Design a protein around this ligand. Structure first.
Ligand SMILES: O=C(O)CNC(=O)C(=O)O
Ligand SMILES: [Mg+2]
Ligand code: NI
Ligand SMILES: [Zn+2]
Length: 331
């Protein structure tokens, strides 16, 4: 069995290996990458996502989200308070202001310490989930706006044609902006490209150990657990590395820098934070190996998780018994 300790693997494809996305994902899996839940892909030196980032300031962040925490430093939830619209240029200035900027630090490990110690005492503003793409249309390799769609994968594997579309999302981050512990909708893969700016630190639980994380989360968030049998679908709970180590939960960590891709694998729980002003682009995708994970994926039916139009068909076809209850939660 490849990668039996479930370590995060880092890949350096050549330009020739960067041509066929599906084939490279399947290669990574042949080497055991999925066992970690997360892999890093460093693009060949010849590749670029686009020529420059000099003209992105007029992108609108229609609903910036202020991430307000409740709890203790290592075990907290966050809610998102909607703020007034602002442009990327306005948001970049805000991120760099004395109130929000990254503090002085020695290295990524010192910053990580400062994040865990101090996150809860601040409410950073995240420009998340913005439909769009920063890949140049002429970038033919690993262009997240040109991937094969999940609807087409389900059709190729299962023969059923379904409605829905699959497009990318931009994330504009600042120091302390946080992504809570989650797997993807329907336990899909995700791919995330860090276009510019400061790094993003990731934490991940191997898929084979995801239920250990879920059991801890039910213990640590006991009211939330009573409210919903899949409350980590709400994407609000944070648990620190220190707490995970104290409770024997297997995980790994890695820092993504600008110009690098990360891939999350089906049922790989992940969480993390941004080091300073940055912009990432991400999208979900599927492969044949996902289908069995989609069929088994938990679902939130309490009403909180509320998701895209396109998840309807996935539930309806892969999880027909759950469909009725899940759709009640959507409506
Ligand atoms: O970058 C973020 O805020 C969160 N991204 C992801 O969870 C992802 O790409 O799967
Ligand atoms: Mg612009
Ligand atoms: Ni994710
Ligand atoms: Zn729920």
């Amino acid at each position: 069995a490849q990668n039996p300790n479930c370590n995060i693997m880092i890949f350096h494809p050549t330009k020739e290996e960067f041509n066929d996305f599906d084939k490279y994902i399947a290669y990574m899996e042949s080497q055991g990458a999925h066992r970690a839940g997360l892999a890093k892909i460093i693009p060949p030196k010849e590749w670029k996502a686009r020529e420059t980032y000099d003209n992105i300031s007029e992108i609108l962040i229609a609903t910036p989200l202020q991430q307000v925490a409740s709890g203790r430093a290592g075990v907290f939830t966050q809610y998102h308070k909607k703020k007034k619209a602002m442009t990327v240029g306005e948001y970049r200035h805000l991120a760099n202001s004395k109130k929000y900027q990254t503090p002085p630090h020695q290295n990524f490990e010192d910053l990580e310490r400062k994040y865990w110690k101090n996150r809860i005492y601040n409410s950073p503003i995240y420009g998340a989930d913005i439909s769009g793409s920063l890949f140049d249309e002429n970038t033919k390799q690993w262009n997240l706006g040109h991937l094969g769609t999940i609807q087409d994968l389900l059709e190729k594997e299962c023969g059923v044609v379904i409605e829905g579309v699959n497009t990318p999302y931009l994330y504009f981050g600042m120091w302390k902006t946080t992504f809570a512990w989650h797997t993807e909708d329907m336990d899909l893969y995700s791919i995330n490209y860090l276009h510019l700016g400061e790094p993003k630190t990731w934490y991940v639980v191997p898929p084979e150990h995801g239920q250990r994380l879920e059991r801890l989360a039910r213990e640590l968030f006991p009211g939330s657990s009573r409210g919903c049998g899949a409350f980590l679908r709400h994407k609000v709970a944070l648990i620190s590395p220190t707490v995970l180590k104290e409770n024997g939960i297997p995980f790994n960590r890695i820092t993504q820098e600008a110009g690098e891709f990360m891939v999350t694998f089906p049922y790989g729980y992940h969480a993390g934070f941004n080091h300073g002003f940055n912009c990432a682009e991400a999208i979900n995708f599927a492969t044949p190996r996902w289908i069995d994970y989609g069929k088994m994926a938990s679902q939130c039916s309490c009403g909180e998780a509320r998701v895209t139009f396109s998840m309807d068909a996935f539930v309806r076809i892969l999880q027909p018994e759950r469909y009725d209850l899940w759709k009640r939660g959507q409506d």
